[PDB]
PDB file of C-alpha atoms in Angstrom:
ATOM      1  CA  UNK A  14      25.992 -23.190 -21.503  1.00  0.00           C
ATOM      2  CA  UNK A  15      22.963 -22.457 -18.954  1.00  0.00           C
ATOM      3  CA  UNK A  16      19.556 -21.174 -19.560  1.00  0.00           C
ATOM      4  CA  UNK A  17      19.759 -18.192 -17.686  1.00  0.00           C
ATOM      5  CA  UNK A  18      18.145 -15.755 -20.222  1.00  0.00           C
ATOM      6  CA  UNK A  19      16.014 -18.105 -21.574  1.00  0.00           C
ATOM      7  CA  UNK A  20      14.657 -18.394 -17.817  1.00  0.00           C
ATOM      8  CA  UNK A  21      14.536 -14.771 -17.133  1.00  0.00           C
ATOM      9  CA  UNK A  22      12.959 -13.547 -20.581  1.00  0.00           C
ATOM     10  CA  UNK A  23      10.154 -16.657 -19.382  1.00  0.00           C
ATOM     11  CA  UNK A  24       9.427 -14.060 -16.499  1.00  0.00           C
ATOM     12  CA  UNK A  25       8.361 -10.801 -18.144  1.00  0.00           C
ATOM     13  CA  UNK A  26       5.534 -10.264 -19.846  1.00  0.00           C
ATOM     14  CA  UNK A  27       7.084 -10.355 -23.766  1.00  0.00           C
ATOM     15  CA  UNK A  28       9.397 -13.739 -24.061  1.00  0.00           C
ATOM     16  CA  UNK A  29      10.040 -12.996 -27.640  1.00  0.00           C
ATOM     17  CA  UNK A  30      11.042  -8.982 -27.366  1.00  0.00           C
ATOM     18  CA  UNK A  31      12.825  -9.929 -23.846  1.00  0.00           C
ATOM     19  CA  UNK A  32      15.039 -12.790 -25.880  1.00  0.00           C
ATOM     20  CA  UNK A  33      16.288 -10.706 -28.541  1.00  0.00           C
ATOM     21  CA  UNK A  34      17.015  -7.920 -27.162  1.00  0.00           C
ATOM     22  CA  UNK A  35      19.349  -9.570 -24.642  1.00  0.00           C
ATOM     23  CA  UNK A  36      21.176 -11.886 -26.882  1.00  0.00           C
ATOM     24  CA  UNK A  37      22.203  -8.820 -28.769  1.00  0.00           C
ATOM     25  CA  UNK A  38      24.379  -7.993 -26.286  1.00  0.00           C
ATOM     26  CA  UNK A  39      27.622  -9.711 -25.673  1.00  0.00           C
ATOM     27  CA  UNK A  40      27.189  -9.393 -21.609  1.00  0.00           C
ATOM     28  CA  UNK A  41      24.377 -12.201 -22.103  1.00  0.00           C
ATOM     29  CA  UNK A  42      27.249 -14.678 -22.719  1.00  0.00           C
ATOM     30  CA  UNK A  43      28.315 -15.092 -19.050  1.00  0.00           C
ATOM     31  CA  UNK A  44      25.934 -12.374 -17.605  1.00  0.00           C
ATOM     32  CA  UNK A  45      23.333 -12.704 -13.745  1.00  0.00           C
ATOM     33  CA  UNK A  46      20.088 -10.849 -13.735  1.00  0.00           C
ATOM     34  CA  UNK A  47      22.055  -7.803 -12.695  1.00  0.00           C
ATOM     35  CA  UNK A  48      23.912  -7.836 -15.713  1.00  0.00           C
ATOM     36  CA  UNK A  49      20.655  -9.131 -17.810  1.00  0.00           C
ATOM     37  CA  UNK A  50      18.548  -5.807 -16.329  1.00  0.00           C
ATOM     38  CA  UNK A  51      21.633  -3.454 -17.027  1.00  0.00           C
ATOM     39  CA  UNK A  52      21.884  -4.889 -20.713  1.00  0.00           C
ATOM     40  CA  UNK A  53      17.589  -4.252 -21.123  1.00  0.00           C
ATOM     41  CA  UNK A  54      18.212  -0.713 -19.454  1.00  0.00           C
ATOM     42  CA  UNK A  55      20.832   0.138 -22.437  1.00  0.00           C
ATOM     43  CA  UNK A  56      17.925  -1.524 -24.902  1.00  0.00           C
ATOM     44  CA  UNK A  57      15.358   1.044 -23.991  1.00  0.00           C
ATOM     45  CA  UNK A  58      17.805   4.058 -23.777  1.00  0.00           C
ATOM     46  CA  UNK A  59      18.964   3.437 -27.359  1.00  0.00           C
ATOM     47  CA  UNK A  60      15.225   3.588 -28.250  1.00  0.00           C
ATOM     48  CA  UNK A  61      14.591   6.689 -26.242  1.00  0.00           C
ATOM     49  CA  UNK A  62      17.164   8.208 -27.969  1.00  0.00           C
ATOM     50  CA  UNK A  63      16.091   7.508 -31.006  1.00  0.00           C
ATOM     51  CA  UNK A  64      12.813   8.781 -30.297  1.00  0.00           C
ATOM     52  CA  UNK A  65      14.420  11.870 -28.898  1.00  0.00           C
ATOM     53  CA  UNK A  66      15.996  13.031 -32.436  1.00  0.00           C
ATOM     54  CA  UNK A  67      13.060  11.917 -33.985  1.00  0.00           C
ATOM     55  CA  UNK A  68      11.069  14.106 -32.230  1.00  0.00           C
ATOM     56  CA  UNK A  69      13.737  17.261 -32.445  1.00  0.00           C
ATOM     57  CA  UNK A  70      14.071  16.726 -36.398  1.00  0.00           C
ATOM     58  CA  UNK A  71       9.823  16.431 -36.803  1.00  0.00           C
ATOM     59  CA  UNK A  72       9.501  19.962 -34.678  1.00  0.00           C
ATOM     60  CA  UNK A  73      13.124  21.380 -36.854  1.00  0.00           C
ATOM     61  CA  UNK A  74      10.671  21.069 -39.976  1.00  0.00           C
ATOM     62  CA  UNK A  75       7.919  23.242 -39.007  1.00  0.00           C
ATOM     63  CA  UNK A  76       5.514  20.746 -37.224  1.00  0.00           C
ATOM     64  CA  UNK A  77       1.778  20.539 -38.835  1.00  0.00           C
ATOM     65  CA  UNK A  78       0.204  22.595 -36.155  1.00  0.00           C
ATOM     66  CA  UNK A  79      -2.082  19.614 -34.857  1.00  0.00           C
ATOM     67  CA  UNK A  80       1.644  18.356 -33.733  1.00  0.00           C
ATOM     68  CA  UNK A  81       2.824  21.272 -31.877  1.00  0.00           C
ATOM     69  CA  UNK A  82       1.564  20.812 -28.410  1.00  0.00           C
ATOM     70  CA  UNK A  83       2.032  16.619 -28.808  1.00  0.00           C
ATOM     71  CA  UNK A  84       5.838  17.028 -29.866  1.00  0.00           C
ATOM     72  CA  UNK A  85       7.037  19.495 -27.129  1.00  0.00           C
ATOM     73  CA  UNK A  86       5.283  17.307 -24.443  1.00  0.00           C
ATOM     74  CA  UNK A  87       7.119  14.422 -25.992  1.00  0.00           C
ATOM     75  CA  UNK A  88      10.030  16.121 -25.906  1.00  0.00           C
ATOM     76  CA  UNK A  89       9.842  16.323 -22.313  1.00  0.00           C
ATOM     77  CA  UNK A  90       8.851  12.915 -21.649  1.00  0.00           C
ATOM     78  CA  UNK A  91      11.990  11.697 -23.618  1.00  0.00           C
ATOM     79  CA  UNK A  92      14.245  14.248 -21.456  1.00  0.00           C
ATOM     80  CA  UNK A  93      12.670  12.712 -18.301  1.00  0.00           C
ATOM     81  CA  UNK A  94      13.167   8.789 -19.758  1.00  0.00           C
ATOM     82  CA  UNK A  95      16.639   9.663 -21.156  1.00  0.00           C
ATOM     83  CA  UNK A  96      17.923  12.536 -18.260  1.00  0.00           C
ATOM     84  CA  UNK A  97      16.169  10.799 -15.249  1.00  0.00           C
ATOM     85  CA  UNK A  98      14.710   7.699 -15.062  1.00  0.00           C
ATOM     86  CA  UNK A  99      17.333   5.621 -17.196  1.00  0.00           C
ATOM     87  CA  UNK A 100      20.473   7.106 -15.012  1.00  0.00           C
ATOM     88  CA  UNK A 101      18.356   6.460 -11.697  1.00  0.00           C
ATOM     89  CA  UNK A 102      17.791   2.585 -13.101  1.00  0.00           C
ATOM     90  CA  UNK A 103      21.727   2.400 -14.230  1.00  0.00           C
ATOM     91  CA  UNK A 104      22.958   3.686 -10.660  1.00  0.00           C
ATOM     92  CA  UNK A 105      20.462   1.351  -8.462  1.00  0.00           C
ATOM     93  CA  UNK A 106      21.593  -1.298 -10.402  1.00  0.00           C
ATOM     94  CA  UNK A 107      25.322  -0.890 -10.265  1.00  0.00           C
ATOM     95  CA  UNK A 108      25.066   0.305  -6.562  1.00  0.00           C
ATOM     96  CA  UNK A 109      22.791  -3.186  -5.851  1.00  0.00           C
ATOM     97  CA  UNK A 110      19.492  -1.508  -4.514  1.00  0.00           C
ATOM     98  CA  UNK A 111      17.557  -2.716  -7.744  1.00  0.00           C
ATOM     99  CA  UNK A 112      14.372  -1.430  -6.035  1.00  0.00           C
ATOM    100  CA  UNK A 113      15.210   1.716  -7.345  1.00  0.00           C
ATOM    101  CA  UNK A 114      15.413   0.604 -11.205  1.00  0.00           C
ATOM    102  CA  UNK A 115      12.243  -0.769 -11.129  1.00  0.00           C
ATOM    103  CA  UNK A 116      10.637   2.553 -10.193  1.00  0.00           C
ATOM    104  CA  UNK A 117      12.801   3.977 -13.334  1.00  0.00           C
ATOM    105  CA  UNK A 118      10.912   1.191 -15.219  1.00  0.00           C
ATOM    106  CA  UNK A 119       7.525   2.094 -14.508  1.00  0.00           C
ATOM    107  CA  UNK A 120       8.595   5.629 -15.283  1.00  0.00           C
ATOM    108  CA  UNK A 121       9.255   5.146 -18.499  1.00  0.00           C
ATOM    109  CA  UNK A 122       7.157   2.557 -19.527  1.00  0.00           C
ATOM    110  CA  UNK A 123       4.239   5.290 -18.502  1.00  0.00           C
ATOM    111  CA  UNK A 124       5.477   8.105 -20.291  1.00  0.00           C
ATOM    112  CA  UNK A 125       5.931   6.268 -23.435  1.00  0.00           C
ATOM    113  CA  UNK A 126       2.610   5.408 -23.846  1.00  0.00           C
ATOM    114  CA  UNK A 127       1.492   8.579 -22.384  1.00  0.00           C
ATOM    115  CA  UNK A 128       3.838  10.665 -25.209  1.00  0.00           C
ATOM    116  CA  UNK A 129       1.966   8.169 -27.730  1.00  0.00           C
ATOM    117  CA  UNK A 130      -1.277   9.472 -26.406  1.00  0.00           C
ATOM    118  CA  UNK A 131      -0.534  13.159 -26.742  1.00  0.00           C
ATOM    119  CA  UNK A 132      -1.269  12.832 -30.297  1.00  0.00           C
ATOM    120  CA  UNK A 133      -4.733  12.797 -31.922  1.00  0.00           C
ATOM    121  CA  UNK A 134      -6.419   9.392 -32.894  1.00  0.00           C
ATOM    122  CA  UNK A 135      -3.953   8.655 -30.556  1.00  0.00           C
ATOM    123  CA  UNK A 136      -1.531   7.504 -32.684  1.00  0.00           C
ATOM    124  CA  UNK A 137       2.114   9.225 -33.412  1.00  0.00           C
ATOM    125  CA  UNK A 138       4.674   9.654 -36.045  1.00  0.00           C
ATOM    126  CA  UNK A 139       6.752   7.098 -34.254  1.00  0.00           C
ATOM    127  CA  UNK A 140       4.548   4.936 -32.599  1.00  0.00           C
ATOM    128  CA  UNK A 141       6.828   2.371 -33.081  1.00  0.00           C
ATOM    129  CA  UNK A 142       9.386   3.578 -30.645  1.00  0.00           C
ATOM    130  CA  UNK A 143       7.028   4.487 -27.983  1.00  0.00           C
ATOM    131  CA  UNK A 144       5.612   1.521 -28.167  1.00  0.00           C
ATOM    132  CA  UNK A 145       9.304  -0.100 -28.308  1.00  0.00           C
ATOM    133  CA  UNK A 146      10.332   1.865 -24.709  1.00  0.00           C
ATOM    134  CA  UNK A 147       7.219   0.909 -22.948  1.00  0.00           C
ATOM    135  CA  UNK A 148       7.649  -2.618 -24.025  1.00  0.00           C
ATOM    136  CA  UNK A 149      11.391  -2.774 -23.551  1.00  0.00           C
ATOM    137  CA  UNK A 150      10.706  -1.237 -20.104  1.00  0.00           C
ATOM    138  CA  UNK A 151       7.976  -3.239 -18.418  1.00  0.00           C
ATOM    139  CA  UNK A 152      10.339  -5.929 -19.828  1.00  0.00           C
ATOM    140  CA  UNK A 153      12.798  -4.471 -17.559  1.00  0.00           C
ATOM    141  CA  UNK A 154      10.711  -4.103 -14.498  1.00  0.00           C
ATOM    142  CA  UNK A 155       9.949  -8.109 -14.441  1.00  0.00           C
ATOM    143  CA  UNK A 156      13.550  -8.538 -14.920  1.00  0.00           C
ATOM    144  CA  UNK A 157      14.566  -6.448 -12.142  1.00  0.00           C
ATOM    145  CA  UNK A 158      11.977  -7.920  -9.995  1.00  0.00           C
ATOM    146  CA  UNK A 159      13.772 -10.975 -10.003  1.00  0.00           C
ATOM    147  CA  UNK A 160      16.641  -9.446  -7.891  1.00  0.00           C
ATOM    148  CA  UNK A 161      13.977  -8.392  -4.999  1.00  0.00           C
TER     149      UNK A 161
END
């Protein structure tokens, strides 16, 4: 019945990604901007993830050399987003000291595109996922900004 994540998704920097992403959860129903920034949080880690196997099954076949270095370091990055930076977000949130998820947020939004940029010509195998978490999480970081 209210416009609440029609409002919020207004106040980040991608209406369009921001809308979508939290209509596809059912918390969105009846949800505040707590819930709204926990339900974005989950959107990035199931992207993460994703890029995470990606990343193990691309170095499982024998990596073209030129991919070697850019995979491991991504491989970290993902660890960080995924080990890190999404749990910090999920327990400042839940606790109610948001300014803590935001740093998450920045986190992960950097390493994304900084994983993407490991690779030569700068673009990577799955530059649609790093380019998904960064997006997803600045996303986040206006959201959560809104509880400050």
């Amino acid at each position: 019945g209210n416009n609440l994540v029609e409002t919020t998704c207004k106040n980040t920097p991608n209406y369009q990604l921001c809308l979508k992403t939290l209509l596809s959860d059912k918390r969105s129903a009846t949800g505040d901007i707590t819930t709204l920034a926990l339900i974005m949080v989950d959107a990035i880690k199931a992207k993460a993830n994703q890029a995470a196997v990606t990343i193990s099954k691309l170095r499982h076949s024998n990596p073209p050399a030129a991919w070697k270095g850019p995979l491991k370091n991504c491989a970290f990055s993902y660890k960080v987003i995924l080990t890190a930076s999404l749990p910090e977000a999920i327990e400042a949130l839940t606790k109610g000291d948001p300014k803590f998820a935001e740093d998450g947020m920045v986190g992960s939004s950097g390493d994304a595109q900084e994983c993407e940029e490991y690779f030569k010509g700068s673009k990577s195998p799955f530059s649609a996922l790093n380019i998904a978490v960064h997006e997803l999480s600045d996303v986040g970081r206006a959201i959560v900004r809104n509880l400050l």
